[PDB]
Ligand binder design. Structure first.
Ligand code: CLA
Ligand code: CLA
Ligand code: CLA
Ligand code: CLA
Ligand code: CLA
Ligand code: CLA
Ligand code: CLA
Ligand code: KC1
Ligand code: KC1
Ligand code: KC1
Ligand SMILES: CC1=C(C#C/C(C)=C/C=C/C(C)=C/C=C/C=C(C)/C=C/C=C(C)/C=C/[C@@]23O[C@]2(C)C[C@@H](O)CC3(C)C)C(C)(C)C[C@H](O)C1
Lengths: 162, 215, 160, 160
């Protein structure tokens, strides 16, 4: 498992504990898909924290009936109660649609990270540039996972966003 | 076997018959239905690329031969004809529901609400004549394109093929008519869903969270 | 990659960091498709962001039922929340008809902006190339212009 | 498409964009039936705009039940809201018996203005040409004048 994506310059094939290291290619495929999806969702959450502070909350309502007006809602572990329940339901519904439209399962292309979302347009017949992009996706996902957990803890302990 | 006469419905050797209209020759329908369904326009990506027909409503005409050898249940061709007609009528109905509330044309009583305009135009002395004219025109364009024989799968015309094409469509070398038919069918289903939503909002307020203030 | 359109007399082959990876002619084709599309969109956007100033807003309503008018919808970035939501839906529907009627996949006329507009054209292949390059240059200029106009509308209180 | 009773004295094949494909004989036959019916209806309508003014409105009532009088129905677009709508329904019925009695499907004589009326027919194919082109040119001038009178009534607020 030392030739896959992931393994890089700062540390090599990183495995302080005993995960993998015993063959089990299918288990490694499951763990790689888990890592990729977690990194993607993380990166999104990291942006969802940084952007409402660097630029500012969206210019709209998010609830024209209830008049929440976006900016009234705070940023981070406190919008869980402010954003309307139907809004959270719609967000989770979009996430569920993203999960179920593809068919993540053994062998099929959805189990390696290819979820049909072909944005970040990368061309065929030019590998070792697709591979660099995928490795960057993995590394940024790992960094964003640790970062988003740190941001969760920062908001929780400090009582507010940052 | 049994003689040529005395053959009705379930008797052995009774060929299935279809002659509902007094004045038209008897038509003997084959099962088909499933065979026509397998090569039928529809079944886009939204349901997995396969013909989404749970409950098997397209197979009931085939089951007519097993039930009583009588055309009790419609052929899938009739089902497509009904779907097309419903889609067109519901497109017009949705546009009318959202146009009557803002526009008014004739000497009909001023009724922006869609659920009362029909009755109030019935009551209008100068609305009954107009609705009678609408009814006779619809009856003409409906009996001329009677289909009807699509109930047994022999309509001799593709579904929704009224004598109406003022533009160059269906005749240009380009403009694949299969895509146009699929768009018509899917937009018709969408309009039927929209009309059902309008009815639900009218009866159960807050059902569709976009027509809350609508009639 | 000097000879494939663009590359006008000002500067040469402008790519401080791009297309230097491997060439990848098909990646350049995709980026040219995106460039032509963005140029047409931005030309339309700049024209429709400057015209409501050169010429008065269209005579009419744009929403008789909602009693709106073309003259009481503010020009610019303030119009996104003023044009009726169904109006924006119809505009996006026409855009979707433009984007989905003819195929835009690779190795097709839609992949080079060739849809069949044919109104501004000629038959002299040299003049065809000159007009295509003119369209590309005007599109790039309109991209930068419309971004600058958007930012002028945003930072300031209104258009210009 | 030449020789089809359409080219006249001050004009030729007048198509700035008409007959967009310059073919499609079925489309052209449908357009011929359309134009001839439009022209006949227009001629009648201009005739009925200039008959009541130059010859006083009918002496009767036109509605004994609704107490309407011919001399009380205004001449022009305002008459549509004054003539009892049962009368317009009967006009529709006459139009139906005038359109659906004889077939006018493509290929049939009805699709060429040949509804078996004659009365002002002629005998020689060149005289046939003269009569047919006279009818068609008068119908075109009619259509023009009838929509002009439509707009005169709509704008000036009266028949003239
Ligand atoms: C969901 C988390 C997750 C998962 C499933 C994986 C999966 C994988 N990583 Mg990976 N990684 C992650 C997060 C994750 N990573 C993060 C956040 C970082 C940054 C520190 C890295 C950095 C990293 C490197 C540098 C390398 C890998 C490699 C690998 C592969 C080797 C198999 C393995 O050890 O995975 C098993 C997966 C796990 C054991 C995840 C378990 C998580 C533990 C049990 C929970 C506690 C973690 C954390 C301390 C808790 C924080 C929150 C807490 C305070 C509540 C495998 C595909 C190697 C590779 O590419 O091989 C080809 C490799 O060299 N990873
Ligand atoms: C009564 C109207 C009507 C009719 C006759 C048809 C007929 C047909 N549809 Mg169709 N359809 C309709 C409405 C209709 N559709 C609507 C409104 C939608 C939107 C959801 C669809 C979506 C749809 C899809 C996605 C597909 C079809 C297909 C078909 C064909 C095979 C299915 C069949 O035999 O069902 C005919 C019998 C019926 C439809 C019985 C309807 C009576 C039920 C019991 C009413 C229950 C609904 C109730 C009011 C609750 C409302 C729910 C809400 C979503 C509105 C057939 C031609 C398939 C196809 O194209 O095959 C090639 C296919 O893949 N339809
Ligand atoms: C008593 C029933 C009956 C019968 C046997 C007929 C028979 C006929 N009609 Mg007819 N019709 C009927 C009722 C009937 N109609 C009604 C009620 C109307 C509405 C006013 C019409 C309106 C009508 C038009 C406008 C035309 C016909 C035409 C025709 C002829 C051929 C085309 C055809 O059948 O399509 C029409 C088929 C139907 C209308 C189906 C009617 C089925 C009935 C209504 C039963 C419905 C019961 C329900 C389940 C308060 C628990 C045919 C002789 C056509 C014609 O004259 O020849 C070209 C034609 O153009 N019909
Ligand atoms: C949609 C944008 C877009 C795209 C896809 C292209 C694509 C292309 N251009 Mg091009 N161009 C553009 C906009 C664009 N251009 C604009 C606006 C200008 C005016 C400055 C130019 C001026 C220009 C010249 C002068 C030349 C090209 C050339 C080319 C081709 C080769 C270069 C290349 O690979 O670039 C790929 C595309 C990019 C690298 C675009 C990336 C855009 C960056 C990442 C974002 C920029 C953000 C912006 C500056 C700030 C916005 C606000 C921000 C704060 C949010 C390629 C087809 C060359 C050519 O014709 O080759 C044959 C050539 O000579 N272009
Ligand atoms: C990117 C292309 C684009 C987009 C998104 C818009 C969008 C808009 N235009 Mg606009 N416009 C465009 C190109 C565009 N236009 C071009 C190329 C011209 C020059 C003919 C105009 C001329 C124009 C006028 C004169 C007016 C608008 C207006 C409007 C707004 C109301 C919708 C409307 O009537 O549009 C009409 C769009 C067209 C006719 C283009 C086809 C809306 C924000 C109205 C407005 O809000 O006033 C400020 C208005 O009065 N536009
Ligand atoms: C809706 C009304 C209508 C319709 C359907 C037609 C249809 C037609 N006209 Mg026409 N025409 C009209 C109004 C109309 N006209 C009016 C109002 C005028 C007066 C300005 C004319 C003056 C006119 C001329 C001078 C000629 C035609 C000709 C034609 C025929 C070929 C051109 C074409 O495809 O045009 C759609 C076609 C049958 C041409 C023709 O008959 O072929 C030789 C021809 O030369 N038209
Ligand atoms: C030959 C048979 C015939 C008969 C018996 C009638 C009988 C009638 N017509 Mg009439 N009509 C006919 C043919 C006929 N029409 C034809 C062929 C045309 C078209 C040229 C018309 C066009 C016509 C108009 C435009 C009007 C009538 C109206 C009337 C009614 C006037 C009495 C009244 O006040 O309402 C009882 C009366 C019942 C009037 C009416 O219905 O007013 C309510 C009216 O305005 N008719
Ligand atoms: C094109 C289909 C579509 C429509 C037509 C539509 C319309 C409305 N959306 Mg929705 N939406 C998506 C699709 C659509 N939304 C998608 C794909 C997402 C990504 C997950 C998404 C996200 C959210 C969130 C986060 C919220 C939200 C809401 C409302 C709302 C307000 C109603 C009311 O308040 O009057 C209305 C009218 C907000 C809310 O208040 O829900 C009660 C809210 O918080 N939406
Ligand atoms: C050139 C002759 C002619 C005139 C001048 C005329 C005029 C009016 N028609 Mg009419 N018409 C035809 C001929 C003519 N109509 C024909 C051949 C057809 C079959 C295609 C047809 C169909 C309908 C329908 C279906 C309706 C209708 C009506 C009205 C109406 C409004 C009256 C008012 O609101 O007082 C006016 C002024 C509507 C109505 O409202 O009737 C209560 C109505 O529903 N018409
Ligand atoms: C021939 C087909 C056709 C009809 C028949 C039609 C009719 C109406 N259009 Mg429409 N339309 C197109 C086609 C047609 N429109 C096309 C190709 C475009 C280019 C994208 C376009 C653009 C817009 C915009 C931007 C708006 C708009 C609207 C209305 C409106 C108002 C209703 C009401 O308020 O009374 C009515 C009746 C306004 C709106 O608010 O609709 C609710 C509005 O904002 N339309
Ligand atoms: C009489 C009467 C009434 C009435 C009436 C009625 C029925 C009036 C009827 C009016 C009617 C029938 C109005 C249509 C005209 C047709 C037109 C304008 C077609 C134009 C078409 C044109 C100008 C196209 C020209 C082309 O050049 C183009 C554009 C492309 C070229 O390549 C080809 C040609 C040359 C073809 C009232 C109103 C009911 C009450 C009143 O009290 C009494």
């Amino acid at each position: 498992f030392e030739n896959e994506r992931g393994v890089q310059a700062p540390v090599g094939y990183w495995d302080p504990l005993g995960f993998a290291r015993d063959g089990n290619v299918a288990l490694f495929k499951i763990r790689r898909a888990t890592e990729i999806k977690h990194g993607r969702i993380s990166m999104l959450a990291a942006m969802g924290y940084i952007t409402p502070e660097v630029t500012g909350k969206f210019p709209g309502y998010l609830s024209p009936s209830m008049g929440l007006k976006f900016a009234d809602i705070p940023n981070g572990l406190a919008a869980i109660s402010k954003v309307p329940g139907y809004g959270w339901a719609q967000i989770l519904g979009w996430m569920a649609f993203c999960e179920i439209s593809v068919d993540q399962s053994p062998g099929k292309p959805g189990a390696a990270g290819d979820m049909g979302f072909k944005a970040f347009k990368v061309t065929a017949d030019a590998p070792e540039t697709t591979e660099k992009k995928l490795a960057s996706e993995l590394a940024n996902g790992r960094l964003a996972m640790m970062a988003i957990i740190g941001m969760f803890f920062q908001d929780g302990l400090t009582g507010s966003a940052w | 076997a049994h003689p040529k006469h005395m053959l009705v419905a379930g008797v052995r050797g009774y060929e299935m018959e279809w002659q509902p209209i007094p004045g038209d020759a008897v038509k003997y329908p084959k099962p088909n239905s499933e065979e026509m369904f397998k090569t039928m326009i529809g079944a886009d990506v939204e349901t997995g690329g396969e013909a989404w027909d749970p409950l098997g409503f397209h197979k009931l005409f085939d089951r007519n031969f097993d039930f009583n050898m009588l055309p009790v249940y419609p052929h899938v061709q009739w089902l497509r004809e009904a779907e097309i007609k419903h889609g067109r009528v519901c497109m017009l109905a949705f546009i009318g529901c959202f146009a009557q509330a803002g526009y008014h044309i004739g000497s009909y009583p001023v009724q922006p609400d869609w659920s009362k305009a029909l009755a109030e135009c019935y009551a209008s002395p100068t609305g009954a004549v107009g609705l009678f004219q609408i009814s006779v025109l619809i009856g003409w364009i409906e009996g001329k394109n009677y289909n009807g024989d699509a109930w047994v799968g022999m309509s001799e015309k593709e579904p929704g093929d009224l004598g109406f094409d003022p533009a160059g469509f269906t005749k240009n070398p380009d403009f694949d008519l299969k895509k146009a038919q699929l768009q018509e069918i899917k937009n018709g289903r969408l309009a039927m869903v929209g009309c059902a939503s309008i009815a639900a909002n009218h009866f159960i307020p807050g059902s569709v969270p976009l027509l809350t203030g609508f009639y | 990659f000097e000879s494939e359109l663009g590359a006008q007399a000002p500067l040469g082959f402008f790519d401080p960091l791009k297309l230097t990876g491997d060439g990848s002619v098909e990646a350049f084709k995709r980026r040219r498709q995106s460039e032509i599309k963005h140029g047409r969109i931005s030309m339309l956007a700049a024209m429709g962001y400057m015209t409501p100033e050169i010429t008065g807003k269209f005579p009419g309503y744009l929403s008789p039922s909602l009693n709106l008018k073309f003259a009481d919808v503010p020009n610019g970035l303030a119009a996104v929340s003023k044009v009726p939501a169904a109006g924006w839906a119809q505009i996006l529907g026409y855009m979707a008809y433009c984007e989905t009627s003819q195929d835009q996949s690779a190795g097709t006329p839609g992949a080079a902006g060739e849809f069949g507009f044919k109104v501004i054209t000629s038959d002299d292949d040299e003049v065809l190339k000159r007009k295509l390059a003119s369209e590309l240059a005007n599109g790039r200029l309109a991209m930068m212009a419309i971004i600058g106009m958007f930012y002028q509308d945003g930072l300031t209180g209104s258009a210009w | 498409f030449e020789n089809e009773l359409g080219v006249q004295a001050p004009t030729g094949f007048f198509d700035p964009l008409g007959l967009s494909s310059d073919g499609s004989i079925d489309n052209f036959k449908r357009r011929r039936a359309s134009e001839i019916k439009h022209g006949r209806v227009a001629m009648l309508a201009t005739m009925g705009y200039m008959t009541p003014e130059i010859t006083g409105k009918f002496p009767g009532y036109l509605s004994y039940s609704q107490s309407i009088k011919f001399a009380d129905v205004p001449n022009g677009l305002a008459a549509m809201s004054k003539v009892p709508v049962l009368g317009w329904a009967q006009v529709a019925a006459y139009g139906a018996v005038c359109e659906l009695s004889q077939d006018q499907s493509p290929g049939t004589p009805g699709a060429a203005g040949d509804f078996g009326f004659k009365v002002i027919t002629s005998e020689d194919e060149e005289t046939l040409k003269r009569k047919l082109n006279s009818e068609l040119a008068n119908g075109r001038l009619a259509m023009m004048a009838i929509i002009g009178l439509f707009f005169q009534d709509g704008l000036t607020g009266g028949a003239y």
